[PDB]
Amino acid sequence: IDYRGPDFHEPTPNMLAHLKEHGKIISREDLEKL
Amino acid sequence: PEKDGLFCERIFGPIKSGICACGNYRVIGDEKEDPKFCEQCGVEFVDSRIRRYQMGYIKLACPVTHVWYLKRLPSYIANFLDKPLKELEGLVYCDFSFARPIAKKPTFLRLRGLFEYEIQSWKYSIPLFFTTQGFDTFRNREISTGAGAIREQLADLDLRTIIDYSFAEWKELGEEGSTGNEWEDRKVGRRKDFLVRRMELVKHFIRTNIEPEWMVLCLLPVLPPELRPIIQIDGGKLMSSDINELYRRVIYRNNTLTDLLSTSRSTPGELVMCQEKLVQEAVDTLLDNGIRGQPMRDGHNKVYKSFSDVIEGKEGRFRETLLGKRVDYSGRSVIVVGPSLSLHRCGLPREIAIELFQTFVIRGLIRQHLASNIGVAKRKIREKEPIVWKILQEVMQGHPVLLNRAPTLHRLGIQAFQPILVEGRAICLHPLVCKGFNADFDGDQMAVHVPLSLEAQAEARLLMFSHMNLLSPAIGDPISVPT
Amino acid sequence: MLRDGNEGMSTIPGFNQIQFEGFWRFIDQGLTEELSKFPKMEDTDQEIEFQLFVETYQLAEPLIKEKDAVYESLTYSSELYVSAGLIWKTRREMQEQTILIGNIPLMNSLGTFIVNGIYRIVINQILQSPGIYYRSELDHNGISVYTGTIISDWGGRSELEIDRKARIWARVSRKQKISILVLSSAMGSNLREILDNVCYPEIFLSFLNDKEKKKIGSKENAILEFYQQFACVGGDPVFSESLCKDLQKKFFQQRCELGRIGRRNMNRRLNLDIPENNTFLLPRDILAAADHLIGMKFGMGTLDDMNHLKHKRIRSVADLLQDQFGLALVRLENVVRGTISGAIRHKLIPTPQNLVTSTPLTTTFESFFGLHPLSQVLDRTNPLTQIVHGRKLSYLGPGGLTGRTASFRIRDIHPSHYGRICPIDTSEGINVGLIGSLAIHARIGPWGSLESPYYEISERSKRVQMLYLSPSRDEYYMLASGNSLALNQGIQEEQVVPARYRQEFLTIAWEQVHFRSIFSFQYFSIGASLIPFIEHNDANRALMSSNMQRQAVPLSQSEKCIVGTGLERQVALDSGVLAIAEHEGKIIYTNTDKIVLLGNGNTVSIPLVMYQRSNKNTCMHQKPQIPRGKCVKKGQILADGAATVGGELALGKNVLVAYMPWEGYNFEDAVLISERLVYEDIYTSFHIRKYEIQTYVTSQGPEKVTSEIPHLEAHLLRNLDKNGIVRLGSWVETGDILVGKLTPQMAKESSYAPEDRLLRAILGIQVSTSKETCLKLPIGGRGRVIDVRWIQKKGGSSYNPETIHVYISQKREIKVGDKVAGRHGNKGIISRILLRQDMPYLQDGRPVDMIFNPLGVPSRMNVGQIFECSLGLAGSLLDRHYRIAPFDERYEQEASRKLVFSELYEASKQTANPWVFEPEYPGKSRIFDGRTGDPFEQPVIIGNPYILKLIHQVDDKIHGRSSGHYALVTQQPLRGRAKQGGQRVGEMEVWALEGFGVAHILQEMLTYKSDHIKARQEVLGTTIIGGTIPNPEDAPESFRLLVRELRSLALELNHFLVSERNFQINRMEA
Amino acid sequence: AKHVREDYLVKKLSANEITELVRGERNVPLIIDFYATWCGPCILMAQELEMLAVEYEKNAMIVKVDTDDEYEFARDMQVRGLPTLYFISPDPNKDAIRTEGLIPIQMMRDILDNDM
């Protein structure tokens, strides 16, 4: 079954990856604490 | 547990068969010459069955009115004393009263009074008139409060005089016409019914071995420990009983009462009354919780399971414990249709049959000298030897089994059958009896039972077989017809 | 925020947007709107101060991974960091730093949370929305009671009533505080000049012109007349601060916080004009409520419905998580209050992090996901159930109706659950009509109202002609469901179609149609939309047709259905079982443990799921799809999954079927399958069972693990490894030891039974101080060990209790007793399995693969199977698959008949098989007998339907018990099959035994096989050896217990045996 | 923004951007797609172009023009039908190719491989 196509919704985004803004990596979090 | 506690081994039996409080063990095994008590231990070495039958006993240093006879609908105490329920309910619990017990002792104190304590002025009004000569020589002579005055009054009035007086009152009421006012129409009837139930109760008391003073109890029995156990789980988890909680509360408050009363010396005032009535309310909660205005709740915002809660209810006592009993020699299954079976025959799976006729197969192995000991026979059973099925095809021929449909609806829901061994995991049932069971084959479960007694086998074979029960008892119409 | 708006208006939306959108809305706004509610708490000494800056919060990337979260039974969560300092009023300083408030769980791609290694999902709830509702429940005297109930956000009811032009009163609760006045707690002009706003303010105007006295500040001063403090007191009430605060909830706090929905509903019902930001009770609101109440009797007026969806609201994961976060923040502020109380008396200057610990948030969320009835473990029987679980609605739960105090009208289909709630998918049993599903196109709109798409008909052609209508806007439009394929000699615009105006069903001309539903999958749920030819099945059978697809067992190898509805593709897409590409590129590496793709520079590795265990003990086995070197766009399928062949869901197999009574072996609902289904692995599935055994630290020792056990049969330890845990590959049978730990038993030779001492002394058996503790395999549960896990503890305690998990798989075939079900509610129990030469064969010699009972069709009235049956045959003879949308009888009359018969004729003509379409009884053919070579006298309907295999297997239902464990108190067999209990007999059963007049049978089911302590042992003895079973004398222990707790209430119960020959009392002891 | 990959690879460009692309120096073949939303067969063409833009990662540039936006520019390019593709060679010596209709993807590959 070919997804995408005309009769299927847009692809579901990975929820962690979808959180572009309200989420930071551990390195930046460590850096901003000092 | 502990000595003098909820699980006090000193009063109950040993927690282990033979092991005493210290830990020594005595071989008895018989009802013969053996020390009844082990000196320092003072504990018999008989089985721990006595654990679940020994009765505890506590003393409340205050008479306690039974909840059933005081709080419930038309309490018998009100009829016994010919007093309004509000009066006696204020004598105790609310404690907004001071009763006067008329008794054997003379009444040199002027007049009687009945009860009057609800006015804030009485804190320092009566002391000018009260006492004036000692404290115990006036207050403790008479005018008692709490349940003590109620119990003494119960122990005072003569039943025969009550019968005579109530008969006189009935005669007086019966000779009045009235029938003019609706209030007057309904006032006479209630009083006459009150008098009639009063003489009924009094006459029942007169000719019986039961004394009225026993409704105001003074000594509280305690349920045996084993029937209210604390579950021992691995790691130290304990699943105790709420009964232990209410019992602990009651005995601790009673201990506080004993400490306060035995330390009278400088006698206090309202504090003694407050603590005594708190003890009374605690006993009230223990006996019948959920019937008072405020039901006490444990550490989960949930009311306790009272003794009345255990007694009363579709899931408590008198409903399913004494009627619905799980039995041995039983096993669930799934039902399929067998058209080849005869009317007097069913089909049992090989797995179910071996777990129901196991002991008869142990017969077959031991008697036929194919095995020697119980352990050897069970070991041979557990390994599925080819001779095991020859025994569990030989002790089942002629031994009926009762098949029961789990959602029983009518009389023909349980029927006896002659089982045979089938290969698979499903019970084959005759199609004609299906409407007798009201059973389809979309997925259903049937429970099997094995009658062990010879009389029971005769009953099953000669009274519950589907060849002498071919007619329904409704109107007498056939119950097994080609569907 | 909004995504592509035309989702659900041009395609079927993904069956995840509820949970996904709820969580995203929570993360985006609830955190901000809950952090602001955190106070500026401080100390009474004017010495310290705590502040929480709001517009600085952010989350952190989770430390552990989801695979490791479920691998170590951890909790997949992210740390919440907020930047805020602490102010000390000792040197007037403020130390600013970023602190860690706590941890918040995160959803995965499935819409679930991983809490303590368990998948959990949040169920939506339906609650009555705040607002004003008028009612009338009559009276026994024949009196109309006009109630004006008002519901706040929390549930504060302040009713208003009139009794034949009586005094309007604010009934608080029960029958008390019958207050009549509408005084203000500020400005209420009780005198005049504002109350005369509708028709008349007289209504017994203060009786004698004052009723007491007049406005001033209160109708007797002292605030709120004399009922300022009338709630509860021990005597006479007197105003006090605590009483005032307690009654503020009943006056203002908990009975005038309407909220957004409450304000909107009040402005709608009463048709007022107040700014929407005002969410409190105004005097004009109560004035208009009283006006409407009095005017209802005077002709005009109408009464509200408690079941209309415009009077209800939906709570989802967003609101539940917001409330949980609020509770957690309250707990946190209490903790900081305690710490700041303890931060001065110890004379320490701590950093802000020392004033906040992550105890409240973590424990609060664990308690929420562990105790709340609206958070339930995910059902993973098959890909269908994962999708079905997420989209559920329930009236139950906190603050809602229960299964006992729910009326009968609430258990019916209102004419508003049409585009929003499926009407044929509910929960059977006591909670019937209280738990339902969501419509396929349904969507939670603003204010928690369910919305449905409709095509607007207008002569302007705006741009997007589709709208999302709410229940409040639904009943005032004329929603057609007809067609434009009808022409008369006049004009086409006067043709008549069925419609739905208000709450009725009319038939109107095309010229007065405002909206037009166009979607076939709009009034049903996911379960009901997987039934082909649903329009030919009785609506009574649809419930169980939907309910028997959630019990399907994913088989080893899957196969697609010839006839379907075309919704299987989206179910497979949204189930989460698949592995869809998150990037472009070419498949440059594939192994059956991983797929590596190269696209746009970087290289992405996707790990497959080889073999795992479901919550219902079923495997989850994935498989790569596209070979090496080919390319995939974003979102396309990369790997298959369990029961998901192709890009489609596949819960069953296509099998040849003939409807005929064979020999009574298909009586009622029995099926008669052939051997071809057991040696070709047509129905064969893997079941993995997880046996977990832990260790404890007792007084003697911490239950040492070992590979040897004293006086245990070595054969039972043949597969035990040297460490003490069975290794992989062992064909462990029943009763075999998996993990055996030598629990240190007491050196209790004194407690040992004399029989044990005799056995150990006479036969020389040694005396050991170790209990026999091992994970013996129960009855059944055989298989081959596929995985072993051994872990310990790591925390404050120095001792590490080791837990062992053993996974035993088992390849179970299809045997007599299994349940095979179709898609049209035709269930069945396999009765017999025949060899291929013993079954009827068609006129081409092919043996039949399954035989059903024809009589089942007229009873359940599901003709839709027959169509599918015939159609399946055509597919099997033409190498084509049909995906037919439901309700195809709109284009034509008897369109399904045309489709089926044309396909059958084409299959019979292209392949010369003249028996496929017999032009004298179409769809039927004359099959022969497999054991006589004779043709059955009448033609038989044959086909290729899609049959499933159900989870209720026979090996999970067998039982048997001669003796064993007894309950501690009742002394009865424990329960069920796990505890080796015995079947229960009670009530009706006894009534049958009394009816038959059998006394010994009834007696021995209560004394011998039950409570008797001393009689079970003796029947065991006289049954091992043989004798005449003696009738018992003493009563069972049930009566002893009865007399015991009737003694605890100061009551007697004495038995007596007054003799008929001596009159001597023989009182039994009890 | 480098966090989630783009769902669609073909980038829509205006008329002036296309003029700049054709006039400016190029080293890879260029594909110009003419399409409209109301078009019937153009959904399939869009899907096929999206598939083609993945196989040719960086060796080709694919763009589309909406005739509803730039109608005169489409008319000037000698477009007499919506499903139209223009193949532009990377060198100015070789002439361009115009293809009309719903052509198969394989012939598109042949066009920009063996003729461009």
Q: Does C883 touch chain A (CB under 8 A)?
A: no
Report the chain D residue with the minimal C-alpha distance to residue A13. Answer: D4
| Catalytic residue IDs of D | 39, 42
CA atoms in the 13 A half-sphere facing the CB of B304: 26
Residue B29 phi, psi (nearest 5): 55, 0
Question: How many CB atoms are closer than 10 A to CB C614?
Answer: 20
The tokens describing C314, both together, are 């939906």
Rounded Cα gap, residues C231 and C240, in angstroms:
12
Collect all residues with Cβ–Cβ distance below 8 Å to C648 and sequence separation of at least 6.
Answer: A1, C560, C561, C564, C568, C569, C572
What are residue D98's DSSP bridge partners?
D86
Q: How far apart are the first and last CA of chain D?
A: 33
What's the reported resolution, in angstroms, to a tenth?
A: 3.2
Longest dimension (CA), chain B: 102
Tell me if A20 sits within 8 A of D4, measured CB to CB.
yes
Beta strand C507-509 pairing with C496-498:
antiparallel
Distance of CA C723 to the CA centre of its chain: 42
* Residues in D touching C633 (Cβ below 8 Å): 50-51, 54
Secondary structure element (H or E) that encloses residue B205, with its range? helix B182-206
How do C515-516 and C435-437 pair as beta strands?
unpaired
Least Cα separation, residue D93 to chain C (angstroms) = 31
Task: Read off the DSSP letter of residue B138.
Answer: H
Whether residue C633 and residue D51 make contact (CB cut-off 8 A), yes or no, is: yes
What distance in Å separates the CA atoms of residue B434 and residue D21, rounded to the nearest whole number?
A: 84
**What are the chain B neighbours of C960 within 8 Å (beta carbons)?**
331, 351-356
Q: Facing residues of C376 across strands?
A: C121
At C968, which amino acid appears? L
Q: Do chains D and B touch (3 or more CB pairs under 8 A)?
A: no
Chain C residue with the nearest C-alpha to that of D48: C633
CA torsion C649-C651-C654-C656 (nearest 10°) is: -160
Q: CB distance C1041–B227 less than 8 Å? A: yes
Contacts of B56 (CB under 8 A, 6+ apart): B8, B11, B12, B221, B222, B223, B224, B225
**Cα–Cα dist C567/C670, whole Å:** 30
Report yes or no: C1017 and C1025 within 8 Å, Cβ to Cβ: no
Hey, which bits of C320-476 come out as E strands? 375-377, 392-394, 435-437, 443-444, 450-456, 466-469
**C147 by DSSP, 3-state: which?**
strand
SS3 C595: strand
User: Which helix (H) or strand (E) covers residue C834, if one does?
Assistant: strand C829-834
Alpha carbon B318 to its chain centroid, in Å, reads 7
Q: Neighbouring chains of C at 3+ CB pairs within 8 Å?
A: A, B, D
Which residues does chain D have within 8 Å of residue C583's beta carbon, measured at their own beta carbons?
A: 5
DSSP string, C455-478: EE--TT--S--EEEE-HHHHTTS-
Question: Measured between CB atoms, which of A16, A29, A32 is closest to C106?
Answer: A16
CA distances from C366 to C64, C261, C316, C363 (A): 17, 30, 18, 5
CA distance C473 to C468: 10
Contact C252, C186 (CB under 8 A): no
CA distance C370 to C367: 5
Q: Which residues of D touch C631 (CB under 8 A)?
A: 51, 54-55
Cβ <8 Å between A23 and C570: no
Neighbours of C244 (CB within 10 A): 13
Any chain B CB within 8 A of the CB of C1014? no
| Residue B378: half-sphere exposure toward Cβ, Cα within 13 Å | 7
**CA distances, C31 to each of C62, C82, C329 (Å):** 18, 11, 11
Residue D97's SS3 state is strand
Residue C469: partners with Cβ closer than 8 Å, 6 or more residues away? C419, C451, C452, C453, C454, C477, C515
Q: Hey, which residues does B346 pair with through a beta bridge?
A: B419
* Element of type H or E holding C31: helix C31-35
Residues 6+ apart with CB under 8 A from C569: A1, A8, C647, C648, C649
The residue among C962, C975, C1042 with the most chain B CBs within 10 A of its CB, best to mutate, is C962
Q: Where are the alpha helices (DSSP H) in B263-385?
A: 270-287, 307-311, 350-354, 358-367, 374-382
For residue B402, give every residue at least 6 positions away whose Cβ sits within 8 Å of its Cβ, in sequence order, or none.
B414, B415, B416, B417, B448, B449, B450, B451, B460, B464, C1001
Residue with tokens 């602490």, as numbered in its chain: C86
Q: How many helices (H) and strands (E) does chain A have?
A: 2, 0
Cβ–Cβ < 8 Å for C357, C594: no
Cα dihedral B43/B45/B47/B49 (nearest 10): -10
What residues of chain D have any CB closer than 8 angstroms to a CB in chain C? 5-7, 9, 50-51, 54-55, 57
User: Rounded to whole angstroms, how far apart are CA atoms C933 and C652?
Assistant: 32
Q: What is the DSSP track for C549-585?
A: STTB---SS----SEE-S-HHHHHHHTS-SEE-SS-S
Which amino acids of B are annotated as binding site, given as ranges?
A: 20, 22, 38, 41, 440, 442, 444
| Contact across the interface for D9 and C584, Cβ inside 8 Å | yes
C1044 touches B at CB < 8 Å = yes
Measured between alpha carbons, how far apart are the two ends of chain B, in Å?
66
CB contact under 8 A, C961 and B447: no
What are the tokens at B431?
A: 């199609």
Task: Give the torsion through C-alpha atoms of C633, C634, C640, C644, to 10 deg.
Answer: -110
Q: Could you tell me whether strands C375-377 and C131-136 are parallel, antiparallel, or unpaired per DSSP bridges?
A: unpaired
Residue D80 one-letter amino acid: R
CB nearest B363 (choices: C960, C989, C1026):
C1026
Give the closest residue to C395 by CA, choosing from C414, C368, C369, C381: C414
The residues that bridge with C86 in the sheet, in sequence order, are: C50, C95
In angstroms, the CA C1033 to CA C1027 distance is: 18
Q: What letter represents residue B218's amino acid?
A: C
Question: In this complex, which chains have at least 3 CB pairs below 8 Å with chain B?
Answer: C
DSSP E strands, C350-419? 375-377, 392-394
